[PDB]
Structures are given as structure tokens and as C-alpha cells.
Design a protein around this ligand. Structure first.
Ligand SMILES: OC[C@H]1O[C@H](OCCCl)[C@@H](n2cc(CN=C3NCCN3)nn2)[C@@H](O)[C@@H]1O
Ligand SMILES: OC[C@H]1O[C@H](OCCCl)[C@@H](n2cc(CN=C3NCCN3)nn2)[C@@H](O)[C@@H]1O
Ligand SMILES: [Ca+2]
Ligand SMILES: [Ca+2]
Ligand SMILES: [Ca+2]
Ligand SMILES: [Ca+2]
Ligand SMILES: [Ca+2]
Ligand SMILES: [Ca+2]
Ligand SMILES: [Cl-]
Ligand SMILES: [Cl-]
Lengths: 128, 128
């Protein structure tokens, strides 16, 4: 199914880092291994990731930013965060407190955080 | 079937500017017409635009910057510049010479340039 250190879930493989980096450097680390800082396509996928991050008690980068235009959120695959999936924001988020343009998993939902924060991160590539 | 003043190429509509503007202004100019400073998704698309600029010998903006993090380039739709498409930098580039954070068509490939420079620009939007 997937490489070692990677986890299969519904057709894709997921790598949970063992180190921390800013968002930009996390984007590239995923590219280094033919993967992408995770883009969420389905409810179940979010659910799964939300829980996996909660279990290890970690904040983790996903591939979602409003770096280009404040308030218009974008997947790293160049798609808009759809109205539907805006529901995954933690309450009161995204709040852009002191310019926060990179999404992290923060307990049960998403938080916009400073891009220069060192977080864990998640790569996704297909099982195939 | 694009609107008048737009050029159709493989599903999309491209607007090649007569006027020169700086990068940020070029981003807004494209938004104003329901489009986006050009994000290059395929190799063919790259070729068409490379041709279209080079035949006039003009520099032109595309929707790509490393403003938010030196060395980690990102398209204006959210997508990071992939390792594969890094092949399109002219040789020696990006050099970030006296700081350069926006990307332009520059002959046969791409050059990083100061964002305040007035350059032509290209919009893109779906033809439906
Ligand atoms: O939780 C509410 C707000 O708390 C902090 O801001 C306080 C002033 Cl409003 C920020 N914040 C949250 C976090 C949690 N994430 C991490 N990652 C590394 C350690 N903490 N950090 N700052 C911010 O993103 C958030 O909207
Ligand atoms: O060696 C080519 C380098 O030439 C200039 O730097 C000189 C000192 Cl290193 C820069 N440069 C090139 C250009 C051409 N682009 C335009 N746009 C409108 C007119 N010039 N501009 N700066 C730079 O981007 C480039 O890497
Ligand atoms: Ca911002
Ligand atoms: Ca923001
Ligand atoms: Ca926040
Ligand atoms: Ca810079
Ligand atoms: Ca730069
Ligand atoms: Ca340059
Ligand atoms: Cl024009
Ligand atoms: Cl020119």
C-alpha cells in the first residue's frame, strides 16, 4: 500500500513528521518525497486527520494558506477553500491575529497561525 | 469561444496586456475582469505564453512570487511552485538580486525581478 513510516487511509498515504518546520519548509519537504502538504478533499479525510493529530497532541501544518490574498483561503493544489469546508475552522477562526496566513490542525478544527511557526506537518500522496 | 480581446488556448482565455503595471497592480487588474494573473498549469501552456511574450521581446508578469518567503515561490492561486516547474527559471535565476520577489517571462524562461517594476501582464480565465 504505502512506504514505511506512512499510513494508508482510503486510497492515499499520509506521513506525519517527526520534526517541526515553518509552513514553507514543510511544503518543500513534502515535495522532496513526491508528496504534497496535505490537501483535504473529503469530510472523512479531515475527520481522520483531525483525530490522528489530536491523538499525538500536536499542531500540524496542512496545505492551506491565504498568503496571496487575506481572507481568500487556498489549497496548495490551487483550489479555493469551498464554502462547505469553511466549517472546519475552530470557532472564532480564521482571525488573522498578527497576520496568520497558514492553517494548522488545532485540536478538533483548524487555526490560522503565523507561517514562521515550527509545527509538525503532514504529507499526502496516493497509494495507487 | 473567449470574449473579444481574449485569446483562446486549450480550454482557457488569456488577456495579454498593452499597459505595463507593477506586480500587485497586475494581480488586481486581472481580478477586476474575473481572471487571475497567469498561473501556468501545463508545459504546453508555458510554451504558448513563452512564445507569445518572446516574439514581442517583452517582459511580462505571471502570477508567481516569493514575497512571503524568500526562496519558496507560490502561484497566486495557492499552489507552491513545484520542483518540476523550477526547470523554467532562466539559468542563474532566481538570483534575488537586490531582492526580487516577483516572476516575469524573460526571453526563453523566467526571471525573478523587483515587484515595483512596470511590466506587461497576462490574465487567464476558463472559457467554459
Ligand atoms: O486560540 C486563539 C488564538 O491564540 C493565539 O492568539 C492569541 C491572541 Cl488572539 C494564536 N495561536 C494559536 C496557537 C496554537 N497553535 C500552535 N502551534 C504551535 C504552538 N501553538 N498559537 N498561536 C492564534 O492563532 C489563535 O487564533
Ligand atoms: O543577469 C541578469 C540579471 O539582470 C539584472 O540583474 C543585474 C545584476 Cl545581477 C536583473 N534584471 C533583469 C531584468 C529584465 N527585466 C526587465 N523587466 C522590464 C525591463 N527589465 N531586470 N532586472 C536580474 O533580475 C537578472 O537576473
Ligand atoms: Ca495576511
Ligand atoms: Ca490570513
Ligand atoms: Ca488564528
Ligand atoms: Ca524577498
Ligand atoms: Ca526573492
Ligand atoms: Ca533575477
Ligand atoms: Cl492593457
Ligand atoms: Cl518589455
Amino acid at each position: 500500500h504505502c512506504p514505511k513510516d506512512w499510513t494508508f487511509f482510503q486510497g492515499n498515504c499520509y506521513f506525519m513528521s517527526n520534526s517541526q518546520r515553518n509552513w514553507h519548509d514543510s511544503v518543500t519537504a513534502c515535495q522532496e518525497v513526491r508528496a504534497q502538504l496535505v490537501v483535504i478533499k473529503t469530510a472523512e479525510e479531515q475527520n481522520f486527520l483531525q483525530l490522528q493529530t489530536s491523538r499525538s497532541n500536536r499542531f500540524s501544518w496542512m496545505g492551506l494558506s491565504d498568503l496571496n490574498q487575506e481572507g481568500t483561503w487556498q489549497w496548495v493544489d490551487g483550489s479555493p477553500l469551498s464554502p462547505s469546508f469553511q466549517r472546519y475552522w475552530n470557532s472564532g477562526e480564521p482571525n488573522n491575529s498578527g497576520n496568520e496566513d497558514c492553517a494548522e490542525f488545532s485540536g478538533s478544527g483548524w487555526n490560522d497561525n503565523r507561517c514562521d511557526v515550527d509545527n509538525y506537518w503532514i504529507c499526502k500522496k496516493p497509494a495507487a
